[PDB]
Write a protein that binds this ligand. Structure first.
Ligand SMILES: CN1CCN(c2cnc3cc(C(F)(F)F)cc(NCc4cccc([N+](=O)[O-])c4)c3c2)CC1
Length: 274
C-alpha cells in the first residue's frame, strides 16, 4: 500500500499502444515515453497486466524497487490510471534474438563479455538472497550501451516464449525444462545453485550464438540423459577454459557447483587473457 514512491503521474507517461514491442502471457509490452524528474523525455517499455483479472499478489515483486545494479533490470515505476509497469527501453531486445541475428557481428570476445555481465547481475541477485528460477539467454536484455540486464523477474516476470515451457498442471508452475538443474527436474524446487546450472546453459547459448540446447533429446528423456552424465558438447568456437567453466555449472552435486562470485572471477580472468 505504501507504494507511493514508485507511482508515476499518468500525465507524465505516454503509452504508444500502436507499437507492441513484446507479448507475454500476462500482457503486451509497448514503446512508451516518460517524463523524468529532470524534466527530460525518456524512452521506456510499458508492460500491461490485463490478463491477471482477480488478484495484486503479483505486486509482491515490488521488492525490485530496492534492487540496484548495472546488470539487473531496474523498475522505473508503476502507473495506475489495467495496472501498468514502466521499465527502461532495451534497444537490442533479448540477448538471444540479438546474437541469432545474422546481420550482427558479435565477436568471440563480445560473447564472453555478455556472459560476464550476466554473471555479475547474478552475483548481485544471489547476495540479496534472490533466486531467479528462469535464467536463460532469452530472458536477458541488451541496451544501447550494449549493457546486458538480467530481466524476467519481479514485475517483469512472464513467459515471452512458451516454446520451451511445460506447465505443471498441479501447481501451474512454468518449467523451462532444458535449462533446469537436474535436482529441479526431480523435485521441482529452485535454488541459487540451480540458477548456476542455468547460467551454464546460458553461456553455452552465447558461444553457439543461440543454438537450441539438446536438439536431439526429447523433453521426456532429458532426465536420464543427465543422470547418465551426458552434457552439452563444446561449441566449435568456445575457448577450452570457458567450456570448463560450463561443466562446473552442471555438476550433479549442487554444493559442488561454483558460486556466482567464483564465476565472476573465472570469466573475468578469461575475458582478459588471450
Ligand atoms: C523491435 N525491438 C525489440 C524489442 N524492443 C524491446 C525494447 N525494450 C524492452 C524492454 C523490456 C523490459 F524492460 F520490460 F524488460 C521488455 C521487452 N520485451 C519483452 C521481453 C522479451 C524478452 C525477455 C524479456 N524479459 O523480461 O527477460 C522481456 C523490450 C523489447 C526493442 C526493439
Amino acid at each position: 500500500q505504501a507504494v507511493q514512491h514508485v507511482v508515476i503521474g499518468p500525465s507524465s507517461l505516454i503509452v504508444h499502444f500502436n507499437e507492441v514491442i513484446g507479448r507475454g502471457h500476462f500482457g503486451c509490452v509497448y514503446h512508451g515515453t516518460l517524463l523524468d524528474n529532470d524534466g527530460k523525455k525518456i524512452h521506456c517499455a510499458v508492460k500491461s497486466l490485463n490478463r491477471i483479472t482477480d488478484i495484486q499478489f503479483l505486486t509482491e515483486g515490488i521488492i525490485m524497487k530496492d534492487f540496484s545494479h548495472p546488470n539487473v533490470l531496474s523498475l522505473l515505476g508503476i502507473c495506475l490510471r489495467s495496472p501498468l509497469v514502466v521499465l527502461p527501453y532495451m534497444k537490442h531486445g533479448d540477448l538471444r534474438n540479438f546474437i541469432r541475428n545474422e546481420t550482427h557481428n558479435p565477436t568471440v570476445k563480445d560473447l564472453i563479455g555478455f556472459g560476464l555481465q550476466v554473471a555479475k547481475g547474478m552475483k548481485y541477485l544471489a547476495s540479496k538472497k534472490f533466486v531467479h528460477r528462469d535464467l536463460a539467454a532469452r530472458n536477458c536484455m541488451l541496451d544501447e550501451k550494449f549493457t546486458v540486464k538480467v530481466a524476467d523477474f519481479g514485475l517483469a516476470r512472464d513467459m515471452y516464449d512458451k516454446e520451451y515451457y511445460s506447465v505443471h498442471n498441479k501447481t501451474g508452475a512454468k518449467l523451462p525444462v532444458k535449462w533446469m538443474a537436474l535436482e529441479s527436474l526431480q523435485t521441482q524446487k529452485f535454488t541459487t545453485k540451480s540458477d548456476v546450472w542455468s547460467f551454464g546453459v546460458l553461456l553455452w547459448e552465447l558461444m553457439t550464438r543461440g543454438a537450441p540446447p539438446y536438439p536431439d533429446v526429447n523433453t521426456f528423456d532429458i532426465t536420464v540423459y543427465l543422470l547418465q552424465g551426458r552434457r552439452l558438447l563444446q561449441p566449435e568456437y568456445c575457448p577450452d577454459p570457458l567450456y570448463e567453466v560450463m561443466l562446473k555449472c552442471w555438476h550433479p552435486k549442487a554444493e559442488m557447483r561454483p558460486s556466482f562470485s567464483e564465476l565472476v572471477s573465472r570469466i573475468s580472468a578469461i575475458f582478459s587473457t588471450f
